[model samples]
Target: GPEHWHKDFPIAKGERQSPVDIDTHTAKYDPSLKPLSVSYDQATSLRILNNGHAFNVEFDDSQDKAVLKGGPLDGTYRLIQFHFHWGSLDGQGSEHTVDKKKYAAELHLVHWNTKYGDFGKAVQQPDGLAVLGIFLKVGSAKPGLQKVVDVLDSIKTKGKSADFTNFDPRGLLPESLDYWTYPGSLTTPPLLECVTWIVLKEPISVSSEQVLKFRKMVDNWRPAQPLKNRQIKASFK
Candidate 1:
């Protein structure tokens, strides 16, 4: 399905395409990169919806507190929404891989540069978006994720939406914030090359049963894109 995206969205073959399979050996350690800092206010969460692609949980950006900043960022970026990329089975799911190894699933926290005024305007710029990526490895259950899984039952189809609030996304992040950063595009259609991807080196644990719940709603990922002349920067040495 991802192979034919260029028919509708020509940028699918763009130079800076995302979901790159990070070659850890080739990644350069950037000493200038700072630790990622986040301050997520639970009240910012508005709703969750199955947008025919993934289960997207949106937030109210008007508050300006929910953010993803530092670590290769020019300025503070505001969190607008977050979503998942998963698979039918446990062996693979994550769009961005490490040494071509896949994780059970991946979480993408979508944020936009505030200087651009609006998300719509920012998506058109080269440095407009910043996506924080975290991987999910199959293992024990994560209680922080239970609240999200519990709501999947109500939104089992495309265009379905429900109230999802009082939730903080930071709960799902891995304990170690060390990550790899790259300049790339969105993994999905319209694949704009505006994203600054910061993928964590560590992965959070997820039970096999919990992954099945995600499969019920979403079940695929855009295969890895070419690394090309892209330079990957690692926060850790």
Candidate 2:
């Protein structure tokens, strides 16, 4: 019976924005996707490069990771690196998605855009790259990912980094192989649509302590923008 019920609570528009409900007006597609196939080399073998700016991994010519490089996604996107974007404080924002979507933080495994002569040119294309999405859940620490978190102390402050000597990403894989895939664009400026989103439904658990370490991040994420007319699909039975 309050006259100002709708006053302070104005109706919001652009409700389909990302970090949103995963079950929204999403079009139901085939769930029986073929078993994701990738060999040891494809899943393992990675060249770690954590510059002071960000953490990245470089993948050599591997068949499994190569499938994501053509048609609707053409270009030689070789795995270049990976890094995490988190908030400055705990129980705050860091991730780019929401619900069965984003988390307190998000991790991007950067790849080289092969369309251009190299990473320099391809990094400029709208559909010039591919990113593997891994959500960092607040829970028990992930043993597999210890290699990554172990290096946090060195890069704790802004403009700080370490070579991550002898490190690989295969150990970070979650038990559940389910994931969401779609033709979306980058969340950053120059917001390019050249990204083939592979958002894993299986979240990697990290201790509250681990997340706290990344809280030192400075403007480490993109804003929660609209999913647009993008079709987000999941790969799970």
Candidate 3:
């Protein structure tokens, strides 16, 4: 239980705010809401550009949907942007929750509701954002991550961007779709409530070598704080 009622999470200008730690028991989805699928073609490009200061991934989508395989909701979701949140010093990772909560590295696959235009415009809506939370653990033996590791050499330049081709990020996702969902704000500054978080239960392993690459990462995460009066929920669906 929180000792004080404060706003630890900050939303962006003209954004909505929500509480954290929603009781999954009481959590409910709109009966009318249907599962969503994600497609890769909609993902215009993958930009590996981070300068250890601040990071942002710009994805070009031409109304293409990034589809999903196993999950309560199986449908296509248009790709928007992807970003990360990390810690400054070694081991002080980001993402706010741990275990059944949060972890070291949290990669957000941000997507917008095509029915509402792009991500920017959708931010103002109550339900316009769809974010996939991928947890990252620092290690050297993460062999499954070779595909991503292969591109580290290309993005060596801080702020300098590189394009990854013939790539499929779907493989990067853990085999499990069991996740926790809730209405929450972005962990970073300008935290927005329009976000629908899908925190995967399984974590994608990475190598200690890649961990070194991430340590070189800057502005990768936001400081952790209290969740104020919001409620968070976990979903088996």
- Report the lDDT tens digits of candidate 3 across residue range 15-121: 23432333345555433333334567544555667655444556666656463422333234466566666665546564645522445676777776666766678
Q: Against the true structure, whose TM-score is highest?
A: 1
lDDT of 2 by residue, 119-235 (tens): 567656655666777777788887767766666666555454444444556667678756666655555433445566666777778888676555433445655555667666666
Check candidate 1 and list the clashing pairs: none
What candidate 2 gets wrong by more than 4 Å, as runs, is 1-21, 24-27, 31-35, 38-76, 88-94, 98-102, 113-117, 124-126, 216-219
In model 2, state the lDDT of residue 60: 51
Error of 2 at 187 (Å): 2.1
Q: Relative to the true structure, how large is the alpha-carbon lDDT of every model? A: 0.88, 0.55, 0.57
Write the candidate numbers in order of decreasing TM-score: 1, 3, 2
Question: Which regions of candidate 1 are displaced past 4 Å?
Answer: none
Residue 157, candidate 3: Cα error in Å is 4.6
Candidate 1 global lDDT: 0.88
The TM-score of candidate 2 is: 0.69
Candidate 1 TM-score to native: 0.97
